[PDB]
Design a protein around this ligand. Structure first.
Ligand SMILES: Nc1ncnc2c1ncn2[C@@H]1O[C@H](COP(=O)(O)OP(=O)(O)O)[C@@H](O)[C@H]1O
Ligand SMILES: Nc1ncnc2c1ncn2[C@@H]1O[C@H](COP(=O)(O)OP(=O)(O)O)[C@@H](O)[C@H]1O
Ligand SMILES: Cc1ncc(C[n+]2csc(CCOP(=O)(O)OP(=O)(O)O)c2C)c(N)n1
Ligand SMILES: Cc1ncc(C[n+]2csc(CCOP(=O)(O)OP(=O)(O)O)c2C)c(N)n1
Ligand SMILES: [Ca+2]
Ligand SMILES: [Ca+2]
Ligand SMILES: [Ca+2]
Ligand SMILES: [Ca+2]
Ligand SMILES: [Ca+2]
Ligand SMILES: [Ca+2]
Ligand SMILES: [Mg+2]
Ligand SMILES: [Mg+2]
Ligand SMILES: [Mg+2]
Ligand SMILES: [Mg+2]
Ligand code: NA
Ligand code: NA
Lengths: 305, 304
């Protein structure tokens, strides 16, 4: 099987009648919802860098979509559609079947259409998904906007995926392979969060982008960081390195006034939310453990580091 | 370091019509009224889409150009791009040239670079996403061709294919620096009945129109616009370059005789050639000096 047959078999599997023009032409066409801005992002996953080489193709497909929906969610936007650019060295039908099932399972979970892409023979498995969302004009939640006194919160748990990576085969590998983009939470934070970012690199570094953009700092409370029971039972310095510098969480970190936090707590959310600290004037990220200053060195993720 | 790379090479310019550009989790664009989003992505792989020794400036240029070509093929006005680049090492001479190529192409066509992703990976792989806008319902589709419509192509076909087989020749410029026919694409909006850009080869790419439109075509071989260099090579190889060479990134379109006259009255920035006609029976046939002319043609396909 060659390119065109591969696209028709694996990447044109569903009807999306609410899309003006899907797969089959030089470009896709989307009629915007009225009074909304386009929200758009792209993230690349490289085999052996963003996932273990032995990762199941279904997980690879899932995560390729999920990490991009996470950046849409981080703006407060509603995700709509994706493009899929996949480059791989050989036609492997078992692999293509699993991969495309992963793409579509993630798309279907979050109501997203696959409307276009590019299919390429290349020496090393590389996937770039583009995600498209829409938001009420002017209402995006930015990385700027955090104010002194705002609570710092994070969704779900942090550190799971990083622990999983260092313990392949452990149950927590599921959080590495199958992160959950917090799509509904992102939408529910529109109008409530004063700033937001998704946690791809590690809580400390990604919160750091908010702190820099907003020209503020934060004090975080280590015993409040939401970690898995498994990490609660390991050495605390190791625990907090996973939680704060592990990365691969794809949770949402956001700031919010006490006032708006009470409003948020009144909503029915599909993920837990944990208040983990507060924005301060001092432009430094500091940590405390049960009332005591806690010195902590955190190495962040960067390509070519 | 990744962050300094983005700031030095890929965040070089300010852009008038972008609600939110580089620096956040996503970019934000305010649509023009009564217009649809037109969106596409194309990947270039080193050693597959370009010779390994290709200059970084040409790699950057072509990375953008091929994506603007797909926007143009819809009749749409390009607006912005995303750049996803994966590469094994930081090479500042390479990155400077590559960036300059990206921005030279963007600037020539009034396009903003508004986001992307920068990655360390074993093999140079570039995926640009292009975004444009078009009056709702006025996209030129592959599916609109009608019996009796003229078949036309812009510019020259076969140049880039010849250039690849004769690296160092002047025609290598058409391999390294294809020209996306942005203005012609826009001017065909409301005139062309169907359109496609010729990335794979005229015969195969016209074929996509024929299949989508459920029609056939008869092409006139002596009318194909080839370079003077190709007129000098024996005709079988000439036809193969012209029809199956690929990498042209010209526009192939169908148009009624009446609308063709209207098109001719416009001032275009590129040559246009009538090369045949849409017919009822659903096959592609070639004609040479008034006679049917059998040709075996294979357009480009990955994994074939
Ligand atoms: N992996 C993929 N997933 C979804 N759509 C895809 C994929 N690969 C290609 N497509 C779509 O299939 C169609 C044909 O792609 P392609 O032949 O590469 O177009 P072009 O030659 O105009 O770039 C396009 O509409 C493209 O968006
Ligand atoms: N090569 C590039 N060209 C243009 N913009 C880029 C490029 N790489 C990254 N960006 C932009 O730089 C910002 C930071 O990117 P990144 O740190 O990867 O964000 P995230 O962690 O949210 O995915 C984003 O706004 C992204 O779109
Ligand atoms: C094999 C393997 N090694 C290491 C990691 C850990 N890892 C890879 S990329 C990354 C950070 C997130 O990737 P990045 O490209 O920076 O995401 P983005 O900021 O673009 O969303 C981490 C922690 C992994 N998941 N798999
Ligand atoms: C080193 C090298 N080998 C071969 C070619 C020729 N070539 C590579 S890809 C291609 C077809 C166009 O690429 P494709 O990915 O199919 O473009 P798309 O249809 O996605 O726009 C051709 C003719 C080249 N340009 N460089
Ligand atoms: Ca990335
Ligand atoms: Ca991301
Ligand atoms: Ca990162
Ligand atoms: Ca391609
Ligand atoms: Ca293309
Ligand atoms: Ca092709
Ligand atoms: Mg095309
Ligand atoms: Mg393509
Ligand atoms: Mg992000
Ligand atoms: Mg990124
Ligand atoms: Na991204
Ligand atoms: Na494309």
């Amino acid at each position: 099987m060659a390119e065109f047959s591969i696209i028709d078999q694996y990447f044109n599997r569903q009807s999306h009648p609410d899309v003006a023009l899907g797969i089959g032409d030089d470009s896709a066409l989307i009629t915007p919802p009225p009074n909304q801005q386009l929200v758009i992002c792209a993230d690349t996953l490289v085999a052996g860098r963003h996932f273990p080489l032995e990762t199941s193709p279904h997980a690879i497909g899932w995560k390729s979509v999920a990490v991009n929906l996470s950046d849409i969610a981080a703006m407060g936007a509603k995700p709509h559609s994706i493009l899929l650019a996949i480059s791989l060295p050989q036609v492997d039908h078992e692999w293509l079947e699993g991969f495309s099932q992963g793409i579509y399972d993630c798309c279907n979970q979050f109501g997203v259409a696959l409307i276009g892409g590019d299919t390429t023979q290349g020496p090393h498995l590389t996937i770039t998904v583009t995600a498209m969302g829409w938001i009420e004009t002017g209402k995006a939640v930015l990385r700027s906007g955090a104010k002194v006194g705002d609570y710092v919160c994070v969704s779900g748990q942090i550190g799971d995926a990083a622990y999983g990576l260092q313990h392949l085969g452990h149950s927590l590998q599921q959080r590495l392979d199958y992160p959950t983009p917090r799509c509904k939470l992102g939408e529910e934070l529109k109008g409530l969060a004063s700033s937001m970012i998704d946690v791809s690199d590690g809580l400390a570094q990604d919160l750091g982008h908010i702190l820099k953009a907003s020209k503020v700092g934060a004090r975080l409370i280590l015993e409040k960081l939401p970690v898995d029971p498994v990490l609660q039972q390991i050495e605390e310095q190791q625990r907090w390195q996973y939680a704060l510098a592990g990365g691969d969480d794809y949770e949402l970190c956001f700031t919010i006034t006490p006032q708006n936090y009470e409003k948020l707590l009144q909503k029915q959310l599909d993920v837990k939310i944990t208040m983990i600290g507060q924005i301060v004037e001092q432009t430094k990220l500091t940590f405390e453990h049960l009332g005591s200053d806690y010195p902590l060195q955190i190495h962040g993720y960067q390509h070519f580091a």
